[PDB]
Amino acid sequence: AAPKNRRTIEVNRCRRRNPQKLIKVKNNIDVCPECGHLKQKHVLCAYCYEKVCKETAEIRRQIGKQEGGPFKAPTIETVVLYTGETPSEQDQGKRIIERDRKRPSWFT
Amino acid sequence: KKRFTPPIYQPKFKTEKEF
Amino acid sequence: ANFVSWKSRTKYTITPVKMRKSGGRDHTGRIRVHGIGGGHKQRYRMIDFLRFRPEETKSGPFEEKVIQVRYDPCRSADIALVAGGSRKRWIIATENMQAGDTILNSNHIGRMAVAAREGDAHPLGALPVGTLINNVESEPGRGAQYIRAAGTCGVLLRKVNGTAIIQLPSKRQMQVLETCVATVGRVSNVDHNKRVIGKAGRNRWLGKRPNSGRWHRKGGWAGRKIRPLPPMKSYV
RNA sequence: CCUCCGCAUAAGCCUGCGUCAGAUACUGACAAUUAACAGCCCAAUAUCUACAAUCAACCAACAAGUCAUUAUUACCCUCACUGUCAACCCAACACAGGCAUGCUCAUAAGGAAAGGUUAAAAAAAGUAAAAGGAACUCGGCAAAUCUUACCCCGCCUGUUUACCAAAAACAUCACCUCUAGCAUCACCAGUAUUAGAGGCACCGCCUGCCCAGUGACACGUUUAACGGCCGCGGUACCGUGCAAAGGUAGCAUAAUCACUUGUUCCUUAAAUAGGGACCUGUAUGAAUGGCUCCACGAGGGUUCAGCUGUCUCUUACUUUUAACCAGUGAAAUUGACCUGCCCGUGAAGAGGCGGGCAUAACACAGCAAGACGAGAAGACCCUAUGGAGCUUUAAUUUAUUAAUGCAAACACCUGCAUUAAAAAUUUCGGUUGGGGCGACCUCGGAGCAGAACCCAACCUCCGAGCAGUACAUGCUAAGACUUCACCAGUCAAAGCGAACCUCAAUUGAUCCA
RNA sequence: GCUAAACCUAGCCCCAAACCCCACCUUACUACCAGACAACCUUAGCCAAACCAUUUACAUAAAGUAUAGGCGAUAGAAAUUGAUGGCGCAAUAGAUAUAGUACCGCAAGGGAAAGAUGAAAAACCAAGCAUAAUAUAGCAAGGACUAACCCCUAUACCUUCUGCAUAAUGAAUUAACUAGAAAUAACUUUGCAAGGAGAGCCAAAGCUAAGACCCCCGAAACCAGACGAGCUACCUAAGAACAGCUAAAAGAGCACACCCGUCUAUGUAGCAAAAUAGUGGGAAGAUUUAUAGGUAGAGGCGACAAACCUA
Ligand SMILES: Nc1nc2c(ncn2[C@@H]2O[C@H](COP(=O)(O)OP(=O)(O)OP(=O)(O)O)[C@@H](O)[C@H]2O)c(=O)[nH]1
Ligand SMILES: [Mg+2]
Ligand SMILES: [Mg+2]
Ligand SMILES: [Mg+2]
Ligand SMILES: [Mg+2]
Ligand SMILES: [Mg+2]
Ligand SMILES: [Mg+2]
Ligand SMILES: [Mg+2]
Ligand SMILES: [Mg+2]
Ligand SMILES: [Mg+2]
Ligand SMILES: [Mg+2]
Ligand SMILES: [Mg+2]
Ligand SMILES: [Mg+2]
Ligand SMILES: [Mg+2]
Ligand SMILES: [Mg+2]
Ligand SMILES: [Mg+2]
Ligand SMILES: [Mg+2]
Ligand SMILES: [Mg+2]
Ligand SMILES: [Mg+2]
Ligand SMILES: [Mg+2]
Ligand SMILES: [Mg+2]
Ligand SMILES: [Mg+2]
Ligand SMILES: [Mg+2]
Ligand SMILES: [Mg+2]
Ligand SMILES: [Mg+2]
Ligand SMILES: [Mg+2]
Ligand SMILES: [Mg+2]
Ligand SMILES: [Mg+2]
Ligand SMILES: [Mg+2]
Ligand SMILES: [Mg+2]
Ligand SMILES: [Mg+2]
Ligand SMILES: [Mg+2]
Ligand SMILES: [Mg+2]
Ligand SMILES: [Mg+2]
Ligand SMILES: [Mg+2]
Ligand SMILES: [Mg+2]
Ligand SMILES: [Mg+2]
Ligand SMILES: [Mg+2]
Ligand SMILES: [Mg+2]
Ligand SMILES: [Zn+2]
């Protein structure tokens, strides 16, 4: 089947500017109390999540360096210790991942 | 008799143009 | 085209010569004869049809020994490697020609008739009337050209004047100078006529391409034609 | 998780995912592939070179085969040149296609079917399915199983319309007809058991009669050349006509004009199907080959049994597709459209016209009744003094070959004729209740057309294509008629010269003879 | 306000005048070995004759005359006479040309597009859209109206036809380009006038001069000369491939690779101008196939399918 006539710009404007086509305004956006960047209420904050992901990447790189190769996952719990921090009694018997920076305030 | 009209290729320069 | 005939060899030899098929194509490259093409590759064996060819520095009648009788791909009749003096040569083998046989080639026309013995070459004037001959020459010293296929045998009918009358296998009569040489007996491979091809593949092996599929109406030529035997072909 | 692969050589291409920097598998610059592998060879003159290969040994062959030097003379004294990359070539493309060889025969090498979500229809691929098991359908197509038997055609293996037909068509061994007595480019480095031009189609039984006609060959022959192969009167056989012979053997409702679904028996519950038969063919029939038959066939029919989603009768699920989100982003089409339904109208089937009815606005997903929907200036049919292909026993020719004969010259060549072969050029009228067939095509009389004239019809009816008489049926000339043009056809006063035409049609231009 | 719009000179057209280091024919652009091989030979056809067949054109004046000619379409003499730029184009124009380049084709061969500042860069306007989607009803307009619509009237255009809203053709739309050439004889207007005209020609008011009438695109075709057998048909040379099993020297069987393409489905602007998946035929031969060569259109080649000869 082929068009029998060219559809006019008036009809085309009707079709493509019908509110069903138009983008819907989102009212679920809100400010993150932690960093103040915008976030959707149900979604996690992009800025804070990126902070956590970068810290996780550093920790995981240290984990890989300590493991030294594939298939060397430890059989014990792991604890991340930052500069100026010593293992506690609970931390005893756990693999220590040392990070060469001050503990982040958000991290606890 | 079989009727076949060979396709006609438009010149390449028309579609090869660049800014 | 750039077609050059493979028949460029100038010196006679016993070695099989590497041939080149034509496929029925003329030197211009166009098909001149249909139904020829492909087939098993073959090597040509130079046949000395001038049976009385006395060796260099020699003359007169001479004998030769049959080393072997060999199938020839280029010929219906099988050939024989006949050796005499210090030379060998391929010749056309007669029916009852075995290895080790002695073959006499002479140019002498005696007053009487030589006792015909199969395989030997004598001038037609020296043969008894009615003897079976083959490899007959049109002219004295021309070389054998007639009665060369398998099982073909000419007949010596008359010897009037210094001429001989020969019944060719096609029954045509031929007058030739009695000095021209012809071998005694019939050509070998007499049963060649009773060869069954069996399959189209064997024809293709022999090198005969299939006939054209186009249907031809048969004209007035088609009907059986009974004609009087043509008159004698004379060469005197 | 996949692995068709993959790695090399060849061929092809020619720097085409190496580095750096800019942009936004691109641009510019820089770099690179190093010969041993491969290519690029050989001083002459003669002279040698029968004995395959196949583990080469037995064997068996046929289609009869890639693999060799010597003699003399020359001559050493001095390792260049070129390919080497890649994700690659031919297909307009990073194209599911094409693409030789050696190894790897599933991999050591090479790769990723899912952009994300949902799990609507319709669509594609696949799997499973109660009971039934072809009841579907043109047909067991497809799918599932592994499955019998009978026919037609063709013997068989092969070949063919690349891109709608793979066949029963073409070829084919076998058989047969015709032609040819011969060598230096095919046939053939051959010679009648050979070669070529053909027909038919292994084999088995056969291939009947005919040369009157045409053709061919001969100066009558020939049908395995084109082809043909009957009647009449009397009551199957008794006589006769005609013909060249009157269709023989065989088979037969055939793939065989129609009748046709021929008539029967078997087969089915039922059969225009299939198979077996017939006083079954005046349109069967014998190398335009006839019957029989072994094998074989993606050939065409029929069928037992099984099998199954073919179907009764559809359902469920997975993947793809799909819809939604993101990126990128065509195509035919399109007069403008503010683009409803019914009836009627009309260029003879209306969204637009008339009378009614209906009627806020726009999206999204489906559907295919219409827009005489898109697509290809319909391939069907007709027309065109438009083409082309092919065949001839269409018209015109023999320039060209081959023969002859006559000249010319002393067989060849040249010129002129004749005959064939091969061809070449060109055409294939019109009317027409569409075209074709049939009929007709010009002229006159009568109706249609009653009365000045004129009037069509493939409307109705009659006729003509002369005949007779005369030889002034001579010559001239006003004025008129006119078949609706012109051409042509008509009448005619007066005058000269003399005597003292009938007939409705009864015909035809120019040029040229 | 975006796409965009414009622009003036790059050049070209018609005339006049004037005559115009090395490598490379082998596989061209390849330093360096016995050759022998050498060119000349009527154009045809389309077309016109309304077909087609003989035939049909390739200074002035005599003259379109003598002649030729299916005496018709048409063809057509000779004697004789005397002989310095642009009322051009200006980037769809003018050369095809920025270039015979890019690109396309095996080859012969075909064949493009386009650029715009300034003295110095060492300084408002087409279509289409957006601003700004839409309100019942209808060739979209007109009469109107206070009022856009509502009311009433109105069957797009062109071509073709007896007759079209026609559900007959064309058209999406904008810009640019794109199609009436001329004699005879007349008519009008001048000049001169029994003469006119700047030899020739005409003339019983004619002659001389001027004005004013004759389109565009489209075939299948025909012929000539080139180019093509890297596809395909067949052939030539010298090569290569064919596992495994059954059988046994087989145009044998099953079956891979390989070749082919039976049937179904999908696809039908497709992955593909003939493919994919399944299924299937052959697969030691009349097999398949790599390389090079050959046969060329009045032809080749053909196990004739009027097959194939660069879709
Ligand atoms: N009609 C015309 N006149 C030209 C043409 N070329 C040059 N001329 C004329 O030639 C004359 C001389 O030209 P110039 O260039 O001044 O001089 P020139 O170079 O000596 O001239 P030529 O000798 O003609 O080359 C002038 O009158 C030009 O108009 C041309 O093509 N056509
Ligand atoms: Mg035949
Ligand atoms: Mg993927
Ligand atoms: Mg997806
Ligand atoms: Mg079931
Ligand atoms: Mg049924
Ligand atoms: Mg059944
Ligand atoms: Mg039914
Ligand atoms: Mg099936
Ligand atoms: Mg067959
Ligand atoms: Mg077969
Ligand atoms: Mg073939
Ligand atoms: Mg086909
Ligand atoms: Mg084929
Ligand atoms: Mg097919
Ligand atoms: Mg056949
Ligand atoms: Mg049935
Ligand atoms: Mg999207
Ligand atoms: Mg209606
Ligand atoms: Mg919709
Ligand atoms: Mg329709
Ligand atoms: Mg349509
Ligand atoms: Mg038409
Ligand atoms: Mg015509
Ligand atoms: Mg009149
Ligand atoms: Mg004409
Ligand atoms: Mg005309
Ligand atoms: Mg003159
Ligand atoms: Mg231009
Ligand atoms: Mg605008
Ligand atoms: Mg309409
Ligand atoms: Mg219309
Ligand atoms: Mg029309
Ligand atoms: Mg249209
Ligand atoms: Mg080739
Ligand atoms: Mg094998
Ligand atoms: Mg086999
Ligand atoms: Mg045929
Ligand atoms: Mg045909
Ligand atoms: Zn945050």
Swiss-Prot record, chain A:
It is found in: Mitochondrion. It comes from the Eukaryota. GO terms for biological process: mitochondrial translation; translation. Zn(2+) binds at C32, C35, C45, C48. Its main location: mitochondrion. MRPL32 precursor is processed by the m-AAA protease (composed of AFG3L2 and SPG7), which cleaves the N-terminal transit peptide. Cleavage by the m-AAA protease takes place prior to assembly into the large subunit, an essential step for mitochondrial ribosome (mitoribosome) assembly. Proper processing by the m-AAA protease is dependent on the zinc-binding region within the tightly folded C-terminal domain of MRPL32: zinc-dependent folding halts degradation initiated from the N-terminus and triggers the release of mature MRPL32. Residues 91-103 have a biased composition (Basic and acidic residues). GO terms for cellular component: mitochondrial inner membrane; mitochondrial large ribosomal subunit; mitochondrial matrix; mitochondrial ribosome; mitochondrion. GO terms for molecular function: RNA binding; structural constituent of ribosome. Residues 86-108 are annotated as: Disordered. Keywords: Mitochondrion, Ribonucleoprotein, Ribosomal protein, Transit peptide. Component of the mitochondrial large ribosomal subunit (mt-LSU). Mature mammalian 55S mitochondrial ribosomes consist of a small (28S) and a large (39S) subunit. The 28S small subunit contains a 12S ribosomal RNA (12S mt-rRNA) and 30 different proteins. The 39S large subunit contains a 16S rRNA (16S mt-rRNA), a copy of mitochondrial valine transfer RNA (mt-tRNA(Val)), which plays an integral structural role, and 52 different proteins. bL32m has a zinc binding site. Component of the mitochondrial large ribosomal subunit (mt-LSU). The mitochondrial ribosome (mitoribosome) is a large ribonucleoprotein complex responsible for the synthesis of proteins inside mitochondria. Belongs to the bacterial ribosomal protein bL32 family. This is Large ribosomal subunit protein bL32m. The gene is MRPL32.
From Swiss-Prot, chain B:
It comes from the Eukaryota. It is found in: Mitochondrion. Belongs to the mitochondrion-specific ribosomal protein mL45 family. Component of the mitochondrial large ribosomal subunit (mt-LSU). Within the mitochondrial ribosomes, required to direct the nascent polypeptide toward the tunnel exit and position the exit at a distance from the membrane surface. Component of the mitochondrial large ribosomal subunit (mt-LSU). Mature mammalian 55S mitochondrial ribosomes consist of a small (28S) and a large (39S) subunit. The 28S small subunit contains a 12S ribosomal RNA (12S mt-rRNA) and 30 different proteins. The 39S large subunit contains a 16S rRNA (16S mt-rRNA), a copy of mitochondrial valine transfer RNA (mt-tRNA(Val)), which plays an integral structural role, and 52 different proteins. This is Large ribosomal subunit protein mL45. The gene is MRPL45.
Swiss-Prot record, chain C:
Its main location: mitochondrion. The keyword Ribosomal protein applies. GO terms for molecular function: RNA binding; structural constituent of ribosome. One of its GO terms (cellular component) is mitochondrial large ribosomal subunit. Disulfide bonds: none annotated. The keyword Ribonucleoprotein applies. It comes from the Eukaryota. One of its GO terms (biological process) is mitochondrial translation. Residues 204-223 are annotated as: Disordered. Keywords: Mitochondrion, Ribonucleoprotein, Ribosomal protein, Transit peptide. Belongs to the universal ribosomal protein uL2 family. Component of the mitochondrial large ribosomal subunit (mt-LSU). Mature mammalian 55S mitochondrial ribosomes consist of a small (28S) and a large (39S) subunit. The 28S small subunit contains a 12S ribosomal RNA (12S mt-rRNA) and 30 different proteins. The 39S large subunit contains a 16S rRNA (16S mt-rRNA), a copy of mitochondrial valine transfer RNA (mt-tRNA(Val)), which plays an integral structural role, and 52 different proteins. This is Large ribosomal subunit protein uL2m. It comes from Homo sapiens. The gene is MRPL2.
